[PDB]
Amino acid sequence: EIKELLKLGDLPTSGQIRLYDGRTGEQFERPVTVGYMYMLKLNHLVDDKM
Amino acid sequence: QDVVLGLYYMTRDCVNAKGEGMVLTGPKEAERLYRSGLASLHARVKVRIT
Amino acid sequence: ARVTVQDAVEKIGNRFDLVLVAARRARQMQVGGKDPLVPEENDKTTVIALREIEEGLINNQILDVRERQEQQEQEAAEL
Amino acid sequence: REEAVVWDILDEVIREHPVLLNRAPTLHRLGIQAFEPVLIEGKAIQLHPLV
Amino acid sequence: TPEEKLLRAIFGEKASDVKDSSLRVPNGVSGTVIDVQVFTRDGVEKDKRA
Amino acid sequence: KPLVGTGMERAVAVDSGVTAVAKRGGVVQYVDASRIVIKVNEDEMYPGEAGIDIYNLTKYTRSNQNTCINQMPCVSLGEPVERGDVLADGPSTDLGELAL
Amino acid sequence: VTEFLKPRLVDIEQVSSTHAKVTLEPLERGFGHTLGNALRRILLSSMPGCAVTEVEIDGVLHEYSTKEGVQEDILEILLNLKGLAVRVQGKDEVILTLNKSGIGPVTAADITHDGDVEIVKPQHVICHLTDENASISMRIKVQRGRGYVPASTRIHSEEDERPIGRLLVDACYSPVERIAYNVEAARVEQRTDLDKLVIEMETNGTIDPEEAIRRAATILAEQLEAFVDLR
Amino acid sequence: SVTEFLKPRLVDIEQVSSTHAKVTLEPLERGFGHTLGNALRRILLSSMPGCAVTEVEIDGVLHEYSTKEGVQEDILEILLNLKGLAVRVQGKDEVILTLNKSGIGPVTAADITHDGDVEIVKPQHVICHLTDENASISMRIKVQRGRGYVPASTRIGRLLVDACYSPVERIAYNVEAARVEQRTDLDKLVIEMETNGTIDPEEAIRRAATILAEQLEAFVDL
């Protein structure tokens, strides 16, 4: 179903695209898993640690 | 982990890789070919090594 | 500067005696009127000490005879 | 006040001055190692990968 | 001590009977004051801010 | 909100009291960053009652862990609400879902 | 063989108000990606633009507060003003004014017209007044700059103790949002090894595509002087 | 203002040898280390012109996997030694050198017949060795002008050599942190470049930056 949803949004069904390096503009030799992960900022902040 | 994976990926060989079979004047020409995109990092090749 | 001390440990045959000799010479150069025997390339007295050890210009025997010499010269002023 | 000259002084005083970095539990003696500090602008220490 | 006694004798800046015990922002903390509450014991006269 | 969630976001955000949930259905008579005034439906108001529910929102107060807990109105002016509908978000809440 | 065919700014296709495709052609083989990535790295980081740097709302002392009648917080109004696309002709600083009363969305089209300041997206909602007696009146200091300058790096720039009520806004001055580039083959007059660089470019509408390509090439050609001399 | 960028104030060129140098430019604006370093690296590596041995024709050899007695190595290694032969050609874009030598010992690059418009930058470049004092090595070498690296695989009696036209042998760059008045986000560009001897490294960096600026001079505003 994830692959069918990727096909619906005109995306590569393997979940992996080809990226390019930002600094040198040349393509990374293998397809990279790119997507949207739900990240969280946890309460262990380096301001309160140092 | 990242270092070992980089050195493993660099030092492997592929069978019909881009630029297979040529003969190089040394490691510097191999780096030139790889950075120019004229040969892949796994192309089995003949290098003059000192 | 120094990133590894292995050349100094080959002249002074230990690391603990190296630490002691280099601390004595660095205390000479830091608090004391003594001048380095090597060109001070913006180094602190610990690294100048270790660079003098590395070149063979300083060891415990050289430090001892230099102390004897300057003390005998300072005691020679009997007036 | 952290004037601009105390940062030049601070670059002078740490130049060849090692610091010891320690991660507790110090299970063995390599849990305390010395390093020369490179002044960075963060609030987190930058520990070399190989160590 | 006698040295700062002489220092008072030369310049004349007489020390004060009070000590600064004020509340300061902790180091590294930077923000906006968004609320101030003043709790005054009954019988103590309220300042202009209370 | 999470683009990938499990469906328990709404239950967690509503059963915790961080959000403002409409007690009686109605129509939003007035919405404001500090309060929501709901004109209750004729079906849900008792006899001898103004029939208006006021929801005062918690603005920028301290949590136990020194974070900000702050309620933002979710509904717009005039739109209809039902019983149980989230009226104002809380901290870590996006349209009534749990957004951490 | 020692002479190169030099690019020219062949075609500029304005797909949208905030979108363009600039074609650079001809390019000798290899210079497509060199020029494309140099231009992308310079465009994405170094283009100049105007951004809101301070806001002064009438009865507001700080961001962590509310106004009566306004549906947003003051902090959400500041985040809505941080996305104000505005282009300023001739100045490097201008204090716009927004006065508005009554129920309705306060959009960027309610900012009082200056002669040398153009709001690119006037439909950009700034806040919402949800009361008929409600009114907002604010002064928005648009300023020209480069890159990203947070407000905590602007709390030091203070000629005099800044008054209470001048709310600082972290300024993102860069007008470009997204740069892509393709290097296709071109057909020029009995030669087939010539490239063509299509820089597809998405901005907030406050910079011209040709002008931004000019600025990127100028920044690059003036940074290359330390190498052309190399003393 | 908003159009004034930092330009490199410290430029420490360190000649590690005659054909290998380390340039250090500091400070660059943040991110211009990679922009400039990679742009010059791509140009030096792929687009810089020069002259190189392109093809060889040896008398008694038909292909690179043939044999030759009297010489101490395969024809493959003779081609590998001619690939590294650096050469400057003044007038033309194509010159044919001739190497005719019989005897004992190495045939250095000083054994190539002396054309008027050709400079061998290292005449002691060993091409091959002769072992028996009755066999000769006789070849027509073909120096051609081009740019970049053009391998022989793309270009498919004669024995094709990989044409190393570009004068650089290695070009690397690092980008380190650089500080100016408590702005530590600046870049510092360390270029390490070795040429094959036809030009020094500083001239190679100058020529690469000139090529790039001349590509840009249709959009630049003076």
Tab-separated table of N, CA and C in Angstrom, chain G residues 113-222:
chain	number	residue	atom	x	y	z
G	113	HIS	N	0.574	52.653	1.327
G	113	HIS	CA	1.377	52.716	0.115
G	113	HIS	C	2.514	53.723	0.240
G	114	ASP	N	3.736	53.252	0.034
G	114	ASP	CA	4.872	54.117	-0.234
G	114	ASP	C	5.145	54.133	-1.731
G	115	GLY	N	5.860	55.165	-2.175
G	115	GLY	CA	6.128	55.296	-3.594
G	115	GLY	C	7.184	54.346	-4.105
G	116	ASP	N	8.115	53.949	-3.247
G	116	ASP	CA	9.288	53.185	-3.646
G	116	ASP	C	9.323	51.817	-2.978
G	117	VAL	N	8.159	51.278	-2.629
G	117	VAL	CA	8.059	49.998	-1.943
G	117	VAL	C	6.898	49.236	-2.552
G	118	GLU	N	7.155	48.022	-3.023
G	118	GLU	CA	6.148	47.224	-3.701
G	118	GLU	C	5.949	45.923	-2.944
G	119	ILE	N	4.715	45.673	-2.526
G	119	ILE	CA	4.348	44.399	-1.924
G	119	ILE	C	4.045	43.426	-3.052
G	120	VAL	N	4.790	42.328	-3.106
G	120	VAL	CA	4.690	41.412	-4.234
G	120	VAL	C	3.435	40.560	-4.132
G	121	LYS	N	3.161	40.015	-2.951
G	121	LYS	CA	1.955	39.227	-2.727
G	121	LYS	C	1.025	39.993	-1.802
G	122	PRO	N	0.044	40.732	-2.325
G	122	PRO	CA	-0.860	41.481	-1.449
G	122	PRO	C	-1.921	40.627	-0.781
G	123	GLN	N	-2.061	39.365	-1.162
G	123	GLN	CA	-3.015	38.466	-0.535
G	123	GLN	C	-2.446	37.788	0.699
G	124	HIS	N	-1.218	38.116	1.079
G	124	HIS	CA	-0.550	37.475	2.203
G	124	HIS	C	-1.216	37.919	3.496
G	125	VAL	N	-1.878	36.990	4.180
G	125	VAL	CA	-2.627	37.334	5.381
G	125	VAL	C	-1.654	37.588	6.521
G	126	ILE	N	-1.757	38.758	7.137
G	126	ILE	CA	-0.925	39.098	8.285
G	126	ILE	C	-1.615	38.740	9.592
G	127	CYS	N	-2.879	39.120	9.752
G	127	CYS	CA	-3.611	38.785	10.969
G	127	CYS	C	-5.100	38.775	10.659
G	128	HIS	N	-5.913	38.559	11.690
G	128	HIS	CA	-7.365	38.525	11.555
G	128	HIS	C	-7.981	39.348	12.669
G	129	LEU	N	-8.774	40.350	12.314
G	129	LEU	CA	-9.546	41.082	13.303
G	129	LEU	C	-10.928	40.462	13.397
G	130	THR	N	-11.319	40.075	14.606
G	130	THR	CA	-12.567	39.362	14.833
G	130	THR	C	-13.533	40.185	15.673
G	131	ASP	N	-13.426	41.503	15.595
G	131	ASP	CA	-14.320	42.386	16.320
G	131	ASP	C	-14.469	43.667	15.519
G	132	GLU	N	-15.657	44.265	15.575
G	132	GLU	CA	-15.908	45.439	14.747
G	132	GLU	C	-15.266	46.691	15.324
G	133	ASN	N	-15.211	46.808	16.644
G	133	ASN	CA	-14.461	47.891	17.261
G	133	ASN	C	-12.967	47.621	17.289
G	134	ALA	N	-12.534	46.439	16.865
G	134	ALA	CA	-11.126	46.090	16.923
G	134	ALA	C	-10.354	46.807	15.834
G	135	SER	N	-9.104	47.128	16.142
G	135	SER	CA	-8.255	47.847	15.210
G	135	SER	C	-6.812	47.529	15.537
G	136	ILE	N	-6.010	47.314	14.504
G	136	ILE	CA	-4.574	47.153	14.660
G	136	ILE	C	-3.890	48.303	13.941
G	137	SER	N	-2.783	48.765	14.506
G	137	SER	CA	-1.999	49.825	13.891
G	137	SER	C	-0.550	49.562	14.237
G	138	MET	N	0.276	49.360	13.220
G	138	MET	CA	1.626	48.891	13.451
G	138	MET	C	2.564	49.511	12.430
G	139	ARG	N	3.848	49.516	12.774
G	139	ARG	CA	4.909	50.034	11.926
G	139	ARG	C	5.921	48.931	11.680
G	140	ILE	N	6.188	48.654	10.411
G	140	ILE	CA	6.927	47.477	9.977
G	140	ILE	C	8.202	47.946	9.297
G	141	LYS	N	9.345	47.736	9.938
G	141	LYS	CA	10.616	48.234	9.416
G	141	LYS	C	11.215	47.218	8.458
G	142	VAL	N	11.005	47.426	7.175
G	142	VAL	CA	11.621	46.612	6.141
G	142	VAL	C	13.041	47.102	5.904
G	143	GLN	N	13.980	46.172	5.751
G	143	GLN	CA	15.390	46.501	5.642
G	143	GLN	C	16.056	45.581	4.635
G	144	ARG	N	17.030	46.098	3.893
G	144	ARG	CA	17.707	45.318	2.867
G	144	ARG	C	18.929	44.618	3.438
G	145	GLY	N	19.207	43.423	2.944
G	145	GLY	CA	20.308	42.663	3.478
G	145	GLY	C	20.623	41.443	2.650
G	146	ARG	N	21.379	40.536	3.262
G	146	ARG	CA	21.932	39.368	2.594
G	146	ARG	C	21.921	38.189	3.550
G	147	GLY	N	21.350	37.072	3.115
G	147	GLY	CA	21.432	35.861	3.905
G	147	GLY	C	20.439	35.818	5.053
G	148	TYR	N	20.855	35.175	6.138
G	148	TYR	CA	20.024	34.982	7.317
G	148	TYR	C	20.691	35.678	8.488
G	149	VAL	N	19.966	36.583	9.127
G	149	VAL	CA	20.443	37.299	10.299
G	149	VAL	C	19.401	37.148	11.395
G	150	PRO	N	19.652	36.311	12.394
G	150	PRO	CA	18.691	36.165	13.485
G	150	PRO	C	18.680	37.400	14.368
G	151	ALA	N	17.601	37.534	15.138
G	151	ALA	CA	17.452	38.707	15.989
G	151	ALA	C	18.446	38.700	17.135
G	152	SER	N	18.850	37.517	17.593
G	152	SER	CA	19.835	37.426	18.659
G	152	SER	C	21.218	37.869	18.205
G	153	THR	N	21.453	37.948	16.902
G	153	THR	CA	22.645	38.566	16.346
G	153	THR	C	22.391	40.029	15.988
G	154	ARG	N	21.219	40.547	16.338
G	154	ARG	CA	20.904	41.948	16.160
G	154	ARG	C	20.586	42.652	17.463
G	155	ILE	N	20.572	41.934	18.587
G	155	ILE	CA	20.453	42.583	19.886
G	155	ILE	C	21.692	43.382	20.262
G	156	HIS	N	22.817	43.174	19.570
G	156	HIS	CA	24.011	43.976	19.808
G	156	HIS	C	24.020	45.266	19.002
G	157	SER	N	23.446	45.271	17.802
G	157	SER	CA	23.403	46.458	16.957
G	157	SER	C	22.367	47.368	17.598
G	158	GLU	N	22.846	48.292	18.422
G	158	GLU	CA	21.979	49.212	19.144
G	158	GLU	C	22.683	50.531	19.396
G	159	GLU	N	22.297	51.553	18.647
G	159	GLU	CA	22.885	52.874	18.825
G	159	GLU	C	22.562	53.374	20.235
G	160	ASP	N	21.314	53.157	20.645
G	160	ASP	CA	20.811	53.530	21.959
G	160	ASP	C	19.887	52.417	22.442
G	161	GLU	N	19.669	52.339	23.756
G	161	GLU	CA	18.797	51.317	24.343
G	161	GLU	C	17.442	51.284	23.638
G	162	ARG	N	17.237	50.229	22.856
G	162	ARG	CA	16.038	50.057	22.048
G	162	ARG	C	14.794	50.089	22.932
G	163	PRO	N	13.755	50.817	22.534
G	163	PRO	CA	12.565	50.948	23.380
G	163	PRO	C	11.842	49.626	23.572
G	164	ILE	N	11.023	49.591	24.615
G	164	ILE	CA	10.206	48.421	24.904
G	164	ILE	C	8.974	48.476	24.014
G	165	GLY	N	8.822	47.475	23.157
G	165	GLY	CA	7.781	47.452	22.153
G	165	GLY	C	8.288	47.299	20.740
G	166	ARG	N	9.555	47.598	20.483
G	166	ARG	CA	10.155	47.276	19.196
G	166	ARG	C	10.461	45.793	19.209
G	167	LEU	N	9.645	45.014	18.516
G	167	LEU	CA	9.796	43.571	18.485
G	167	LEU	C	10.715	43.211	17.331
G	168	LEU	N	11.835	42.580	17.646
G	168	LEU	CA	12.773	42.151	16.628
G	168	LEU	C	12.240	40.923	15.912
G	169	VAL	N	12.502	40.851	14.616
G	169	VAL	CA	12.093	39.738	13.774
G	169	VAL	C	13.349	39.171	13.133
G	170	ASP	N	13.554	37.865	13.262
G	170	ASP	CA	14.686	37.223	12.607
G	170	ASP	C	14.538	37.343	11.102
G	171	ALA	N	15.513	37.972	10.463
G	171	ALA	CA	15.396	38.389	9.075
G	171	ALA	C	16.038	37.358	8.167
G	172	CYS	N	15.277	36.873	7.199
G	172	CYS	CA	15.770	35.970	6.171
G	172	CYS	C	15.741	36.766	4.878
G	173	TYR	N	16.874	37.346	4.511
G	173	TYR	CA	16.881	38.298	3.415
G	173	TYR	C	16.946	37.650	2.047
G	174	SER	N	17.168	36.358	1.956
G	174	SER	CA	17.439	35.757	0.659
G	174	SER	C	16.152	35.664	-0.145
G	175	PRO	N	16.109	36.183	-1.372
G	175	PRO	CA	14.872	36.116	-2.147
G	175	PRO	C	14.614	34.779	-2.804
G	176	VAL	N	15.628	33.968	-3.056
G	176	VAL	CA	15.430	32.705	-3.755
G	176	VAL	C	15.020	31.646	-2.749
G	177	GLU	N	14.098	30.783	-3.157
G	177	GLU	CA	13.706	29.648	-2.343
G	177	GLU	C	14.233	28.331	-2.867
G	178	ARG	N	14.343	28.175	-4.181
G	178	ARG	CA	14.729	26.889	-4.739
G	178	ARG	C	15.421	27.095	-6.073
G	179	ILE	N	16.541	26.419	-6.281
G	179	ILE	CA	17.263	26.491	-7.542
G	179	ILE	C	17.531	25.078	-8.025
G	180	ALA	N	17.152	24.797	-9.260
G	180	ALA	CA	17.548	23.588	-9.948
G	180	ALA	C	18.209	23.992	-11.248
G	181	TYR	N	18.942	23.069	-11.849
G	181	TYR	CA	19.540	23.358	-13.139
G	181	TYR	C	19.701	22.059	-13.903
G	182	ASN	N	19.379	22.097	-15.182
G	182	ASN	CA	19.610	20.973	-16.067
G	182	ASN	C	20.638	21.369	-17.111
G	183	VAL	N	21.413	20.401	-17.562
G	183	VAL	CA	22.417	20.632	-18.584
G	183	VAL	C	22.051	19.731	-19.751
G	184	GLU	N	21.458	20.320	-20.774
G	184	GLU	CA	20.948	19.616	-21.933
G	184	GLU	C	21.894	19.837	-23.099
G	185	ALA	N	21.665	19.114	-24.182
G	185	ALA	CA	22.450	19.329	-25.384
G	185	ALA	C	21.834	20.442	-26.216
G	186	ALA	N	22.692	21.256	-26.814
G	186	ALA	CA	22.266	22.328	-27.694
G	186	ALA	C	22.758	22.053	-29.106
G	187	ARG	N	22.119	22.707	-30.068
G	187	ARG	CA	22.443	22.560	-31.484
G	187	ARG	C	22.861	23.933	-31.997
G	188	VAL	N	24.160	24.130	-32.202
G	188	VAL	CA	24.688	25.409	-32.662
G	188	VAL	C	25.579	25.154	-33.873
G	189	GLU	N	25.033	25.369	-35.074
G	189	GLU	CA	25.784	25.729	-36.285
G	189	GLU	C	26.971	24.803	-36.563
G	190	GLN	N	26.638	23.540	-36.852
G	190	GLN	CA	27.592	22.486	-37.208
G	190	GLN	C	28.461	22.075	-36.025
G	191	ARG	N	27.862	21.947	-34.844
G	191	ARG	CA	28.576	21.490	-33.663
G	191	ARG	C	27.593	20.831	-32.711
G	192	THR	N	27.969	19.668	-32.175
G	192	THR	CA	27.063	18.870	-31.365
G	192	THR	C	27.534	18.638	-29.935
G	193	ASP	N	28.730	19.082	-29.563
G	193	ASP	CA	29.211	18.875	-28.205
G	193	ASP	C	28.916	20.051	-27.281
G	194	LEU	N	27.994	20.929	-27.656
G	194	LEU	CA	27.707	22.138	-26.900
G	194	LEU	C	26.524	21.909	-25.975
G	195	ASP	N	26.681	22.307	-24.720
G	195	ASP	CA	25.645	22.154	-23.715
G	195	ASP	C	24.712	23.359	-23.701
G	196	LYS	N	23.749	23.305	-22.791
G	196	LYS	CA	22.817	24.391	-22.548
G	196	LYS	C	22.328	24.249	-21.119
G	197	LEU	N	22.476	25.297	-20.324
G	197	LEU	CA	22.172	25.247	-18.903
G	197	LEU	C	20.840	25.933	-18.654
G	198	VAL	N	19.847	25.171	-18.239
G	198	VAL	CA	18.539	25.708	-17.907
G	198	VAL	C	18.470	25.790	-16.392
G	199	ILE	N	18.604	26.996	-15.858
G	199	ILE	CA	18.491	27.241	-14.429
G	199	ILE	C	17.029	27.519	-14.126
G	200	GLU	N	16.360	26.562	-13.511
G	200	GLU	CA	14.999	26.748	-13.051
G	200	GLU	C	15.068	27.313	-11.646
G	201	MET	N	14.266	28.329	-11.377
G	201	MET	CA	14.536	29.221	-10.266
G	201	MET	C	13.229	29.675	-9.649
G	202	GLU	N	13.103	29.528	-8.337
G	202	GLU	CA	11.878	29.862	-7.629
G	202	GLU	C	12.220	30.779	-6.469
G	203	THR	N	11.601	31.949	-6.457
G	203	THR	CA	11.876	33.063	-5.567
G	203	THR	C	10.603	33.430	-4.824
G	204	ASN	N	10.700	34.433	-3.963
G	204	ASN	CA	9.508	35.027	-3.388
G	204	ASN	C	8.967	36.171	-4.233
G	205	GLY	N	9.491	36.360	-5.437
G	205	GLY	CA	9.010	37.375	-6.344
G	205	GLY	C	9.675	38.723	-6.222
G	206	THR	N	10.656	38.869	-5.339
G	206	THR	CA	11.267	40.154	-5.052
G	206	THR	C	12.600	40.350	-5.748
G	207	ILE	N	12.941	39.510	-6.715
G	207	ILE	CA	14.167	39.684	-7.480
G	207	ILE	C	13.896	39.236	-8.904
G	208	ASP	N	14.494	39.917	-9.841
G	208	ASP	CA	14.309	39.519	-11.221
G	208	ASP	C	15.230	38.346	-11.534
G	209	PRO	N	14.776	37.383	-12.333
G	209	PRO	CA	15.639	36.238	-12.661
G	209	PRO	C	16.911	36.629	-13.386
G	210	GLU	N	16.807	37.512	-14.378
G	210	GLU	CA	17.996	37.988	-15.071
G	210	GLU	C	18.908	38.745	-14.124
G	211	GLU	N	18.335	39.606	-13.285
G	211	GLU	CA	19.140	40.367	-12.338
G	211	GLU	C	19.849	39.462	-11.348
G	212	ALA	N	19.219	38.360	-10.958
G	212	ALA	CA	19.857	37.458	-10.013
G	212	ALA	C	20.952	36.645	-10.680
G	213	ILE	N	20.765	36.270	-11.944
G	213	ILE	CA	21.850	35.614	-12.669
G	213	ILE	C	23.027	36.565	-12.839
G	214	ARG	N	22.747	37.839	-13.134
G	214	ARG	CA	23.810	38.835	-13.224
G	214	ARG	C	24.554	38.968	-11.907
G	215	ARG	N	23.824	39.030	-10.793
G	215	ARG	CA	24.479	39.177	-9.499
G	215	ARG	C	25.309	37.953	-9.149
G	216	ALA	N	24.807	36.754	-9.445
G	216	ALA	CA	25.577	35.551	-9.160
G	216	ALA	C	26.853	35.500	-9.985
G	217	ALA	N	26.755	35.786	-11.284
G	217	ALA	CA	27.947	35.782	-12.118
G	217	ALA	C	28.924	36.864	-11.702
G	218	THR	N	28.426	38.002	-11.220
G	218	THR	CA	29.316	39.068	-10.782
G	218	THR	C	30.046	38.690	-9.506
G	219	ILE	N	29.329	38.114	-8.541
G	219	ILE	CA	29.962	37.662	-7.310
G	219	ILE	C	31.032	36.627	-7.618
G	220	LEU	N	30.746	35.714	-8.546
G	220	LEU	CA	31.723	34.688	-8.890
G	220	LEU	C	32.936	35.282	-9.590
G	221	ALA	N	32.709	36.166	-10.562
G	221	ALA	CA	33.815	36.731	-11.314
G	221	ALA	C	34.647	37.693	-10.489
G	222	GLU	N	34.093	38.264	-9.427
G	222	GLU	CA	34.908	39.085	-8.550
G	222	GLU	C	35.557	38.283	-7.435
